[PDB]
Amino acid sequence: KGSFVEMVDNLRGKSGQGYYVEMTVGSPPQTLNILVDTGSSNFAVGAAPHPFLHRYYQRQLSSTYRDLRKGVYVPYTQGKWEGELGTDLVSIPHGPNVTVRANIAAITESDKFFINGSNWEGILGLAYAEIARPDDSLEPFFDSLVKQTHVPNLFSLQLCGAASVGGSMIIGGIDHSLYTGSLWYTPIRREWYYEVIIVRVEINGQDLKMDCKEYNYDKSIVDSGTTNLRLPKKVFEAAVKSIKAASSTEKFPDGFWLGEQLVCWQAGTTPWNIFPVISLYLMGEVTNQSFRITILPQQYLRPVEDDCYKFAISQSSTGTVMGAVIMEGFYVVFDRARKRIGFAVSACHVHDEFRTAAVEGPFVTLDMEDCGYNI
Ligand SMILES: CCc1ccc2c(c1)[C@@H](NC[C@@H](O)[C@@H]1Cc3cccc(c3)CCCCCCC(=O)N1)CC1(CCC1)O2
């Protein structure tokens, strides 16, 4: 049919290793698990043996394969792949009831890209052509979907926490059963990454009081393919200082704040109360209007196996990244048709005794124009 209930719970994954959706490529249909990545724009799949691949795309066996006789490579933050461009027919079984001819990068070689036992064999870049490789003429999968079918030009992501993870990618719309309260929208500043503008940051109700330009230096992006909340150096330093001070009744290894060492407590004794909430204020849809999303320590302390955790806020020199840990517990609407991103409290929100993850508005914020970074 293509109705939204068919896409509820269509995502799986492992903590820190991305979320993936099932797809098929070719005729007969070949099934692969595909990482869902709002931080890139290339559709690429393993297409040759690799120690970490359980299966891969075999172009010889597909009668609808077409070679584009062109190479391609994509460098991500920690890994990269190269391969051969082609087109083929693509479907999402737990998706809309459609089949599109899409661009596909067949991965022949890679370095630190695939992850040992992640269960995915490819990546679906859902951001815009501007960051596609080799260049912005290689149409991204979602652009092809929208062009070739009646699927509306938007999708939404409900990434759920815990170890296995699950969630939903609603292709073509919004499923009202996956969130509560109001959707709050922030403009997509520019169509490349899903770029947005942070206008204020508060920690436990205390304004960081930095020039708002620091928050978006050199950009702020919403990125399901990145695990952590990643903050520019100056912001990261101020947030860490503030988070250290709030939790200074416990002792922490110094490698913990850099994201290397685990910290552990007796099962069920995690002192959540000493870790502050973080509020990120985002530019809204009307003049002088913003809204805020509030992050609980259960989002930025990632469980890894006594209860053990990694600090999931880290330093960046390439701007703010609102990664999976921020997106978890929110329903995120990538409303491309209207150049905006919506946030609402997810149905699978995180539980804290006395505190709640929230999306709240409206707020008044003057001079939000000034928060955007320019060279
Ligand atoms: C166009 C390719 C590209 C290049 C650089 C880049 C990005 C994208 C932005 N998004 C990164 C994600 O695309 C990438 C997806 C991914 C690839 C392979 C494996 C995973 C995730 C799961 C494990 C996490 C790897 C580290 C984060 C990452 O590179 N995610 C994130 C930023 C932009 C600001 C930081 O850097």
UniProtKB/Swiss-Prot annotation:
Residues 19-344 form the Peptidase A1 domain. Disulfide bonds join C160-C348, C212-C371, C264-C308. It is found in: Cell membrane; Golgi apparatus, trans-Golgi network; Endoplasmic reticulum; Endosome. The keyword Nucleotide-binding does not apply. One of its GO terms (molecular function) is aspartic-type endopeptidase activity. It is a single-pass type I membrane protein. One of its GO terms (biological process) is positive regulation of neuron apoptotic process. Expressed at high levels in the brain and pancreas. In the brain, expression is highest in the substantia nigra, locus coruleus and medulla oblongata. The active site is at D37, D223. Residues 1-375 are extracellular. Its main location: membrane. N-Glycosylated. Addition of a bisecting N-acetylglucosamine by MGAT3 blocks lysosomal targeting, further degradation and is required for maintaining stability under stress conditions. Acetylated in the endoplasmic reticulum at Lys-70, Lys-209, Lys-213, Lys-219, Lys-233, Lys-234 and Lys-241. Acetylation by NAT8 and NAT8B is transient and deacetylation probably occurs in the Golgi. Acetylation regulates the maturation, the transport to the plasma membrane, the stability and the expression of the protein. The modification N6-acetyllysine is found at K70, K209, K213, K219, K233, K234, K241. It catalyses: Broad endopeptidase specificity. Cleaves Glu-Val-Asn-Leu-|-Asp-Ala-Glu-Phe in the Swedish variant of Alzheimer's amyloid precursor protein. Glycans are attached at N97, N116, N288. DXXLL motif is required for a proper endocytosis and retrograde transport to the trans-Golgi network, as well as for regulation of lysosomal degradation. The transmembrane domain is necessary for its activity. It determines its late Golgi localization and access to its substrate, APP. Responsible for the proteolytic processing of the amyloid precursor protein (APP). Cleaves at the N-terminus of the A-beta peptide sequence, between residues 671 and 672 of APP, leads to the generation and extracellular release of beta-cleaved soluble APP, and a corresponding cell-associated C-terminal fragment which is later released by gamma-secretase. Cleaves CHL1. This is Beta-secretase 1. It comes from Homo sapiens.
